[PDB]
Design a protein around this ligand. Structure first.
Ligand SMILES: [Ca+2]
Ligand SMILES: [Ca+2]
Ligand SMILES: [Ca+2]
Ligand SMILES: [Ca+2]
Ligand SMILES: [Ca+2]
Ligand SMILES: [Ca+2]
Ligand SMILES: [Ca+2]
Length: 335
């Protein structure tokens, strides 16, 4: 006769299984083997095992041994279960269909199968020139759908910083290093930033950060021909172009004006001649220098002309005028 029914060794079985485990991978069952005993003699003592519940379909149970395995056809993916926990009903039956039950609590262990990804992959940011050391430029962030160390990200810059920007490993905040940021030295930067996780086989994602340097007008105009000495015929008439000073300004929208700052005039015997500030003129826009007053060697034999260029657009008074000024020496030849 059938005087007893199956009875499991435990009431709850605590199992675990790694995600992406192949079909036939058996559950790791932490509290003894799954096992139901039936106290009858002979035929009424053998048990058949079933396995039931929402998510039973991911597994198979051996109906004779009660061992439990990943089914073929299916993929166990931790990232589709939050929490990462399955509960199932174990049912043991005997030949007269009397039965017993137990629980199967399965933890889905994490595998580092998701990359740190950046949304968006690219970053474009403007940064004004001459910023102090430590100026925060922008903050990047990567997402990683894994957990624990498999989802915890260290940021770094793989290349492009050129010892001028630094990134906070945790926050992913990029800041100016201890180094000058001069738009005249470099207009833009292209950083590659790596976000790396802490999985045993670590995974990394990367982002392009383009850093565009905005302009302050802070660079002084430079004469390209600072010293010049030219000999002019005493018969050279007013209006005659005799020389030409030219300057470059490396800022974005310079408004260069040219000026004669002094004219020092001298005798053939080297003695000074006063009130010769009208001898020559310079074009304010072109830096073209012209004879303006009629000439004579035995009145003035040489002129030292000093010239300067100012950047009207300048944002810094200190970097608005030429250093050095242009020197033009005009030696008068006899006729
Ligand atoms: Ca029985
Ligand atoms: Ca997965
Ligand atoms: Ca995972
Ligand atoms: Ca990961
Ligand atoms: Ca500058
Ligand atoms: Ca500038
Ligand atoms: Ca300038």
């Amino acid at each position: 006769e059938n005087d007893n029914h199956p009875l499991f060794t435990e009431g709850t079985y605590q199992a675990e299984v790694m995600e992406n485990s192949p079909a036939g991978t058996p559950l790791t069952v932490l509290n003894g083997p799954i096992l139901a005993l039936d106290a009858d003699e002979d035929v009424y003592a053998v048990v058949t095992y079933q396995l039931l519940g929402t998510h039973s379909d991911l597994f198979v149970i051996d109906n004779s041994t009660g061992v439990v395995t990943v089914r073929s056809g299916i993929i166990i993916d931790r990232e589709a279960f939050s929490p990462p926990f399955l509960e199932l009903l174990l049912l043991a039956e005997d030949i007269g269909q009397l039965n017993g039950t137990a629980h199967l609590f399965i933890t889905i262990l994490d595998d580092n199968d998701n990359w740190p990804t950046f949304s968006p992959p690219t970053y474009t940011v403007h940064l004004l020139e001459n910023c102090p050391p430590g100026f925060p430029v922008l903050q990047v962030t990567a997402t990683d759908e894994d957990s624990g160390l498999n989802g915890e990200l260290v940021y770094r810059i793989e290349a492009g910083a050129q010892d001028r920007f630094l990134i906070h490993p945790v926050t992913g905040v990029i800041r100016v290093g201890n180094a000058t940021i001069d738009r005249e030295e470099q207009e833009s930067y292209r950083l590659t930033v790596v976000a790396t996780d802490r999985g045993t086989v670590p995974l990394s994602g990367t982002a392009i950060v383009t850093i565009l340097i905005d302009d302050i007008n802070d660079s002084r105009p430079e004469f390209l021909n600072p010293i010049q000495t030219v000999s002019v015929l005493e018969s050279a008439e007013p209006g005659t172009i005799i020389a030409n000073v030219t300057a470059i300004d490396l800022d974005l929208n310079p408004k260069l004006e040219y000026h004669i700052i002094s004219i020092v005039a001298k005798d053939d015997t080297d003695r000074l001649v006063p009130d010769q500030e009208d001898a020559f003129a310079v074009n304010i826009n072109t830096g073209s220098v012209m004879v303006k007053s009629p000439l004579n060697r035995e009145l003035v034999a040489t002129y030292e002309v000093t010239l300067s260029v100012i950047d009207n657009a300048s944002d810094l008074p200190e970097h608005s005028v030429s250093v050095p000024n242009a020197k033009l020496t005009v030696n008068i030849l006899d006729v």
